[PDB]
Amino acid sequence: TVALTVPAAALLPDGALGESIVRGRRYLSDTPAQLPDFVGNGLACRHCHPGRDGEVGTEANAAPFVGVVGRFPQYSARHGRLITLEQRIGDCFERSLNGRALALDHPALIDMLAYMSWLSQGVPVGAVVAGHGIPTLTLEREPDGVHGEALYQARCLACHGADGSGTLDADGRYLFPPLWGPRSFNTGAGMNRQATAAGFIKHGMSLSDEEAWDVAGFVLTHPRPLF
Numbered sequence: 001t002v003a004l005t006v007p008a009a010a011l012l013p014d015g016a017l018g019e020s021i022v023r024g025r026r027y028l029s030d031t032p033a034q035l036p037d038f039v040g041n042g043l044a045c046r047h048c049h050p051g052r053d054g055e056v057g058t059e060a061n062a063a064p065f066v067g068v069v070g071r072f073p074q075y076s077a078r079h080g081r082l083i084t085l086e087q088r089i090g091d092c093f094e095r096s097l098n099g100r101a102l103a104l105d106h107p108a109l110i111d112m113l114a115y116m117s118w119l120s121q122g123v124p125v126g127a128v129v130a131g132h133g134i135p136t137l138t139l140e141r142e143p144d145g146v147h148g149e150a151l152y153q154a155r156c157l158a159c160h161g162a163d164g165s166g167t168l169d170a171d172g173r174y175l176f177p178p179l180w181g182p183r184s185f186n187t188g189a190g191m192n193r194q195a196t197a198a199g200f201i202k203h204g205m206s207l208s209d210e211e212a213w214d215v216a217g218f219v220l221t222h223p224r225p226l227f
């Protein structure tokens with residue numbers, strides 16, 4: 001692998017590329033408000049691809065976008081063929097954001113690509129960045145949703161709510177995003193898979209593997225939009 005580094009925002013170039021990168025950041029950070037025609041729930045990309053200092057997709061083990069551009073196109077079992085990064089973004093719009101994919105030449109999509117390419121500056125094509133993806137967590141026992149409920153009350157509820165509906169900020173964006181119900185990710189999302197939810201919870205959200213497994217199980221007992 002190669003190291004995860006985050007470029008300096010002060011070193012952004014003047015001109016069309018720099019302006020596109022800034023728009024891209026905003027689409028990724030503020031997706032429901034910026035792209036209402038394409039987002040069907042309350043989630044922005046940053047809610048599963050977090051970043052510090054206003055950036056998005058810069059955190060190891062929380063599916064950073066640093067180095068993502070050099071890993072596409074790639075085979076998708078989901079599609080049964082090679083897909084592009086534009087198509088992969090469309091999938092997260094359809095599933096994680098319960099919405100609609102942008103056209104593959106939509107200016108907002110191109111701005112999101114520009115931003116991801118900026119984060120990827122200096123990463124060799126084909127290289128794997130340390131911390132890429134959301135590593136799965138699997139245990140060789142059933143997730144105990146009863147234990148998970150108790151863990152949820154103790155460790156998660158204060159932010160994500162008794163009803164998993166999250167907490168809005170003053171501007172109507174989710175400070176703490178919804179984990180289930182009509183404003184959360186749909187059943188087609190990767191986060192709807194036990195081992196992915198457990199891995200995300202483990203690395204972001206301290207919890208033991210056993211606790212992450214059980215609380216993921218509890219989270220995933222709830223209704224959410226059907227894909």
Ligand code: HEC
Nearest residue numbers: 043044045047048063088089092093096133134185190191
């Ligand atoms: C509900 C959680 C969630 C939301 C919201 C979400 N994603 Fe994702 N995304 C994931 C998960 C899980 C993966 C799989 C990570 C992995 O490969 O291990 C993923 C993977 C990706 C990848 C591929 C990363 C790689 O390393 O191959 C891209 C690109 C991506 N998402 C873009 C977006 C964009 C753009 C948005 C906003 C439109 C978005 N996602 C919203 C959960 C989410």
Ligand code: HEC
Nearest residue numbers: 046047048050155156159175176177178179201205215219
């Ligand atoms: C300090 C408040 C806080 C606590 C406590 C917290 N979270 Fe989160 N959670 C967030 C925020 C904010 C995000 C959006 C991503 C980010 O910025 O880290 C998030 C994202 C998530 C996501 C992905 C986005 C979505 O809407 O599905 C899941 C799943 C999640 N949290 C589950 C949990 C679980 C389970 C616990 C308890 C083990 C937990 N969280 C504890 C604040 C919290």
